[PDB]
Amino acid sequence: KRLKVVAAFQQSGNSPMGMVLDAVPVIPPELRPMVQLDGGRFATSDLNDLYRRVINRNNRLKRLIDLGAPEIIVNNEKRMLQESVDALFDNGRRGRPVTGPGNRPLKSLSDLLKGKQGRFRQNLLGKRVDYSGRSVIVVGPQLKLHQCGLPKLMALELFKPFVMKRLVDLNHAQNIKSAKRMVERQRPQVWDVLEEVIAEHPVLLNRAPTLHRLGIQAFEPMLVEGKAIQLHPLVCEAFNADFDGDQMAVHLPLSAEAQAEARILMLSSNNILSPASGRPLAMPRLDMVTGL
Amino acid sequence: FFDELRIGLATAEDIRQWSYGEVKKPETINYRTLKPEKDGLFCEKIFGPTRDWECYCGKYKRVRFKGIICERCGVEVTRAKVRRERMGHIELA
Amino acid sequence: QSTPDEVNAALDRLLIADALAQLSAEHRAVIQRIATDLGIAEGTVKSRLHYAVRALRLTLQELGV
Amino acid sequence: EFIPRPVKSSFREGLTVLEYFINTHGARKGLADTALRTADSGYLTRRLV
Amino acid sequence: GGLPRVQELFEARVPRGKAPIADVTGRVRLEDGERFYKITIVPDDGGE
Amino acid sequence: SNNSVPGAPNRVSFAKLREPLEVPGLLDVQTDSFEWLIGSPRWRESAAERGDVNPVGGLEEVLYELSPIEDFSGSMSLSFSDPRFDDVKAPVDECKDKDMTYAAPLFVTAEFINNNTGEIKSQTVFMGDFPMMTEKGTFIINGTERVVVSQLVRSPGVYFDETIDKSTDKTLHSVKVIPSRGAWLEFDVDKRDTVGVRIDRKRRQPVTVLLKALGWTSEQIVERFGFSEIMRSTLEKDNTVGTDEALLDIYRKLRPGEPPTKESAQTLLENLFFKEKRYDLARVGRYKVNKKLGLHVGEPITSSTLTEEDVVATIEYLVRLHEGQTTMTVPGGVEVPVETDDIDHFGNRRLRTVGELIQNQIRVGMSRMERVVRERMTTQDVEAITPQTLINIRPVVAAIKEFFGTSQLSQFMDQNNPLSGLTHKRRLSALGPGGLSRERAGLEVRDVHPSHYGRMCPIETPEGPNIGLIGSLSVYARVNPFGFIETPYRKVVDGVVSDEIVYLTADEEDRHVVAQANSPIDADGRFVEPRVLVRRKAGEVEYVPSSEVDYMDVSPRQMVSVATAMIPFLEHDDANRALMGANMQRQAVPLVRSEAPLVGTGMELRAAIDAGDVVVAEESGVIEEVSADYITVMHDNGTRRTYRMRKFARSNHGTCANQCPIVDAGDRVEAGQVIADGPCTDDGEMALGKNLLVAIMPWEGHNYEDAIILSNRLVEEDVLTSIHIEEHEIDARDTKLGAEEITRDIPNISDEVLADLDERGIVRIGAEVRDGDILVGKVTPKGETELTPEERLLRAIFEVRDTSLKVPHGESGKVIGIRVFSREDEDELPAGVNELVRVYVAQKRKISDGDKLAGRHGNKGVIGKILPVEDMPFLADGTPVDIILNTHGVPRRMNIGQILETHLGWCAHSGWKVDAAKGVPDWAARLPDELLEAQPNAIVSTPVFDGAQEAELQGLLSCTLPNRDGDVLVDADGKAMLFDGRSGEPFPYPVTVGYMYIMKLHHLVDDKIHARSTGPYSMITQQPLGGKAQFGGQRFGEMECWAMQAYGAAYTLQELLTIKSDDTVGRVKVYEAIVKGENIPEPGIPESFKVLLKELQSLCLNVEVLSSDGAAIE
Amino acid sequence: WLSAASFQETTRVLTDAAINCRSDKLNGLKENVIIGKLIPAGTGINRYR
DNA sequence: GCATCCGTGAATCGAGGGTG
DNA sequence: GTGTCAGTAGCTGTCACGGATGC
RNA sequence: CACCCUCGA
């Protein structure tokens, strides 16, 4: 195990001296921002407090070196600088964490990357997306398997730029700017125009938890009145979705490649069988099997 | 398109090569003028201007001065976007 | 906290860029910047700027801004 | 371990006071360990992924 | 068994059962008592 | 009759067991606690009649523990006494309006005693604004009603634990002496058969170290603990010996880095465990210890501190428990069993309510002030010092503000409907300071414990991550001054049931055996059957002879909560669906008009009344003048009291709290009668929903698994309509370039959008506003150096920007109220604000597709279709049903209640008439004579675990009343023949038809619908915001990325993680390409990944991106 | 090392990555998902791309 | 050569409200 | 400029598991 | 935005 560490420094060509620091970097300000409160007071990032404590102790070290303070003070101050830089990089790693106001351990640079709230899992493996919505789901028996019914007010916002384009084309609006104002004021012209936009433009429906890939499926959107999403009764099994307050999220594919992927790979009608067992899922399951 | 992502130990020389200046003073900002203190954790000479093409001393507030290092406050004149990428550093005694 | 969505500004520039093709290359090269480079007068500047603006204003209000 | 005393009543007959109270241990622990089982399952899933 | 058994299998852990196995094919040597259990195998071909 | 005490409607009950004690004040948990805290006359009379000797109010206790204050010499002293309150600063509603705190000034009497001069100066000192509790048990902080939740903590005392080692497989034992305050002390037996002690988390010292520190000779130690080899081996394996040696050992392990003086250690080792300064067992702690060890069992609880005798007896108890001993008598003490304690048993699990939780904070503040006092004494002169110079009340007010403002127990009050608020005030929370962390709660703290019977409900508990950590106090339960939860029981003398009721604690209950409530009892009191169901110590249920029952339960519903007691036929529903029913009753939405349920339980009345959202007459009298605004009552003596109705008030959760008078002008009203009822109330009873005509049948798949079909009648007649009110707020601040001004003059805004605004820029009352409309016109001056080049050109080719208050997306209603505060007009705003406007918008929400309805049995569902009144399957006489529930989602959930509830429901709507001729039938022999005849729309009660039995219900269905035409619509089975309103042909088979009580839950599509094209992005990560209120987008999580990858939709995944998210240039080019009609451009690099690289650099890691050639690229 | 640092033991992985001076060949689903490249699977492989 | 103790990890999405 | 004693709160009410750490 | 609470599938 020791060789495992030593041969690395041997071959790579980097000196082990890097493990001991003579200078510490300062993270840009926008990544440690200081915001203002509605009461006139200020709130700041914990990194600012950590860096500030380190700077205070470092400047005190310079003072002590210049003043020829007793060796005891200089050494006992270098120790505190060590502990403060240790907290800056990974607070709480050694010993007791640096407590903030309220006996709350301050976040460190290494805390920015760990766990569900870390950068990797929270902001890299899964982002938040534009052109998306969510609403309550309702069973729609009359729908076809490849169809889903979304509210008008959902589609209008989702397809806002498309509606603006077609409103300025058909001369319902003088310029694209006034088209935006028209959509934001919900003028009656959009509802007839919106239908042309959503025509054969598939959307993606997702229900958390997304356990398997059939937890997301593509559908052709149908403008429905009301404010609930209308879902086909046969896909409930795949989503494991009952109708007692369940909510589903809608995503609008934009690029031509995205629309093709949704139309061919992810359309509900092309995913009737369970990928785990091969047995069908979109089949008569509850009331349907009873009638038959 | 870029092939590999290399990671390694940061030499002190690299730490200094990244930094646009050393953070000497421990102050943060001023609680009246909202201006970041010079050589502080928000020094505009080091990290960048608070507002686009606006220097600290207020001599250069226009876009005509693109790339001018102000002589009275030492702040460059680019977009505030650089406050998201310019690193500082503390030189340890 | 949080940064707004660049809709408006972008739509505005998308129009401004649509009323830039309705121009002549000289008014364009002038508006995109001065009398020291283009090698002309300052009155020629003031004017070309003046008439070029008025063409921009005319075009914009033609579209209904 | 199973209780040496059963729940004789049916939901059509009507549980006694103590019958309901004694059903609740198992019911609540059912919900609790279900939450825990789901947690461990999801973790195993991400590992396998 | 159960889900922890699935974890034991996927993590290559030293299982709870820790059942032994015949390292060499041969004749069984049941030497059962009550104090303890010891079992030997006489290799069907050569071996020890 | 049911609930014949205030003058309520005559609800008839199927009750077979009489109620010996009527339900207590459901709000006594908060009330009694606070009254004890401030020592009100009512609390003192309560303690006086209770037999208490020397009771102490909450403030008096703190002030006595503090008094006196002396320096190190003792030449100066300061003492406090007699706390009193002046009148309240501002009334409750005014506090809500003006965003201030409901409080009363606290006065105390302090006096300075000077020993070197022999003269005392005593005066009154104002201590601070003390937050006061409303009559409804709530506090008001900064204009918000909050509730202080009772906390389940670990009771002080001595506890023993038997753990099992993992590697050596031997039984180890440990002990913890948990005080009410101070350092902790835990003994243990490791796996080497040696005894040790950890003092305040510190290192584990040998148990003999402590004995040596106290002055005990090694030989006497061997004398006491010689019967065990483990203690002998401990004294042998000891390192140092000597009274003055182990003491310094303790000192250097407890307070390291200091010079060890023999007396410096002798001082603290006596102060940390035997002086009342830094260690104190409350009276309850001392009592608990005195029982567990069996010492001082006769002494009055006067020693508030631990003694050496206790430590010795404790170590003896431990060492004997380790080696199998089961009995022990302390030298000079009574015999006591040797066992381990549960720490979940409600005799060891204590409950501290509002009074105690506030007392601890006042204590912290008072100590923080005491130190400043001792410092200020030795600074000022010793003759011009007054209580006013020594007292700094800053930390006290700061302490109570820190508590109410920031505390897990000061919770935003649940104000959906009265029942929700009541339950909230009767909550028992295990989380919080001094208790435990959520990550520190195994599957054992959450499940039901046999001691919860009659104390904490086993049903009402959240099903989320807080399951088992939050309970509701049982109905008849109360809290004793010690903190434990008592419950009443009927004392059985000699196999005879007595009306003598006594309240027992958990451990007190275990020392006897109690019979179940529904035991057959003679009219005199003797049990009918020799064997009876009996609950026994350690939660053991078995039959026992009648001559063994000591006590028995008061009422069948003794074990359930208030909400749970509100479920009819509760005995026929499983605990899961019952949990959901009780939890969803608290989510009911107050309807425009409220209808009391036909099928009730009896608890509705007292729930509504004790909730406090109605108007009850304090004193009897007649109504002199009644209006929609107020009600004036002329008493008999001559005085007049006027109750003001709360009309269209915004609840904490947007519901409408609206009170309406019931009595009329000149109506005789008795004391305690409901003269006006509020939301979800009808004549004083909780009306959380409506009685709906239900048919149980599948219908064309629109009700498929748990979906609900409703009749448009409920829309046309506002049967399920509800009012919701939103509060909108904006302020005008001082900016760097001037000051934001609220003006009707807004740049580049038409006169058509501003047509509904007054001259100030504020919307006028009564105007209907859609989403996006201007409510308050505010413009803010923007500097010139902040303008886009295209913006500057557009300004040149043609200084304030629009910051008006617009209506958020999805909101719409009538503007009903406006409130304006101006710094110019004396209005005290936060520094930097000149004006503040609040606009109240009210919306009348009809039932819509997707709204969530539910019953009382966890039978929930959304509205999948609202058919016209003619399409609905209608009964024989033409009446169309109101709601269709799918049958398949009924027998799986084991909620037979609804079925029964349905049947009885119909019997209540139509009425019945039992054949009295030829005697009373054999099934109705047990029914009261009041039930043999019932008119249509009759009110009935099915008490929990009592009430209607299936046989009696069968009979009632046999004798249902006919309709107006003389026809009986439903069969004895309870089903009826329905006609399909769409085709006309009658449905082939009879269908169960009845009336069910359905509630409108607070989960409406009008609030839960959301969609986003673009919008705000977080500055750091450049990813779209979250939440509907911030106009955020949905989170494409990790599992969903796995879904995309599984489908192989590579381009869709990249699109999701680049141009649709945090590609700074890509998303803009996408917007442009959409409005241009061009194709979608190529995605760029996520800004979040740039942030990742910069963050890895911040940790001294040189991350670099290399091209195919090998050169690092920037 | 980027696919491992995003799984578990982030610090423990990045330390070893910096010591061994490891280079990440940006050719994996997790990695390209992080940096926003097309996943080398499905419609992302070179045959169909 | 081996028991102790350190550090790692522990489902997904969504709503509203409070304070520092 | 400072000058007699002058001295944390809080808390353990999670757990399984592997391997470096340490007696 | 940091934490906190309550809640929903």
UniProtKB/Swiss-Prot annotation, chain F:
<dbReference type="InterPro" id="IPR037033">
    <property type="entry name" value="DNA-dir_RNAP_su2_hyb_sf"/>
</dbReference>
<dbReference type="Pfam" id="PF10385">
    <property type="entry name" value="RNA_pol_Rpb2_45"/>
</dbReference>
<dbReference type="GO" id="GO:0046677">
    <property type="term" value="P:response to antibiotic"/>
</dbReference>
<dbReference type="InterPro" id="IPR014724">
    <property type="entry name" value="RNA_pol_RPB2_OB-fold"/>
</dbReference>
<dbReference type="InterPro" id="IPR007121">
    <property type="entry name" value="RNA_pol_bsu_CS"/>
</dbReference>
<keyword id="KW-0240">DNA-directed RNA polymerase</keyword>
<dbReference type="InterPro" id="IPR010243">
    <property type="entry name" value="RNA_pol_bsu_bac"/>
</dbReference>
<dbReference type="InterPro" id="IPR037034">
    <property type="entry name" value="RNA_pol_Rpb2_2_sf"/>
</dbReference>
<dbReference type="Pfam" id="PF04565">
    <property type="entry name" value="RNA_pol_Rpb2_3"/>
</dbReference>
<keyword id="KW-0046">Antibiotic resistance</keyword>
<dbReference type="InterPro" id="IPR007645">
    <property type="entry name" value="RNA_pol_Rpb2_3"/>
</dbReference>
<comment type="similarity">
    <text>Belongs to the RNA polymerase beta chain family.</text>
</comment>
<dbReference type="InterPro" id="IPR007644">
    <property type="entry name" value="RNA_pol_bsu_protrusion"/>
</dbReference>
<dbReference type="Pfam" id="PF00562">
    <property type="entry name" value="RNA_pol_Rpb2_6"/>
</dbReference>
<dbReference type="GO" id="GO:0003677">
    <property type="term" value="F:DNA binding"/>
</dbReference>
<dbReference type="InterPro" id="IPR019462">
    <property type="entry name" value="DNA-dir_RNA_pol_bsu_external_1"/>
</dbReference>
<protein>
    <recommendedName>
        <fullName>DNA-directed RNA polymerase subunit beta</fullName>
        <ecNumber>2.7.7.6</ecNumber>
    </recommendedName>
</protein>
<dbReference type="InterPro" id="IPR007642">
    <property type="entry name" value="RNA_pol_Rpb2_2"/>
</dbReference>
<dbReference type="GO" id="GO:0006351">
    <property type="term" value="P:DNA-templated transcription"/>
</dbReference>
<dbReference type="InterPro" id="IPR042107">
    <property type="entry name" value="DNA-dir_RNA_pol_bsu_ext_1_sf"/>
</dbReference>
<dbReference type="Pfam" id="PF04563">
    <property type="entry name" value="RNA_pol_Rpb2_1"/>
</dbReference>
<keyword id="KW-0548">Nucleotidyltransferase</keyword>
<dbReference type="GO" id="GO:0000428">
    <property type="term" value="C:DNA-directed RNA polymerase complex"/>
</dbReference>
<dbReference type="InterPro" id="IPR007120">
    <property type="entry name" value="DNA-dir_RNAP_su2_dom"/>
</dbReference>
<comment type="subunit">
    <text>The RNAP catalytic core consists of 2 alpha, 1 beta, 1 beta' and 1 omega subunit. When a sigma factor is associated with the core the holoenzyme is formed, which can initiate transcription.</text>
</comment>
<dbReference type="Pfam" id="PF04561">
    <property type="entry name" value="RNA_pol_Rpb2_2"/>
</dbReference>
<dbReference type="GO" id="GO:0003899">
    <property type="term" value="F:DNA-directed RNA polymerase activity"/>
</dbReference>
<dbReference type="GO" id="GO:0032549">
    <property type="term" value="F:ribonucleoside binding"/>
</dbReference>
<dbReference type="InterPro" id="IPR007641">
    <property type="entry name" value="RNA_pol_Rpb2_7"/>
</dbReference>
<keyword id="KW-0804">Transcription</keyword>
<dbReference type="Pfam" id="PF04560">
    <property type="entry name" value="RNA_pol_Rpb2_7"/>
</dbReference>
<comment type="function">
    <text>DNA-dependent RNA polymerase catalyzes the transcription of DNA into RNA using the four ribonucleoside triphosphates as substrates.</text>
</comment>
<keyword id="KW-0808">Transferase</keyword>
<dbReference type="InterPro" id="IPR015712">
    <property type="entry name" value="DNA-dir_RNA_pol_su2"/>
</dbReference>
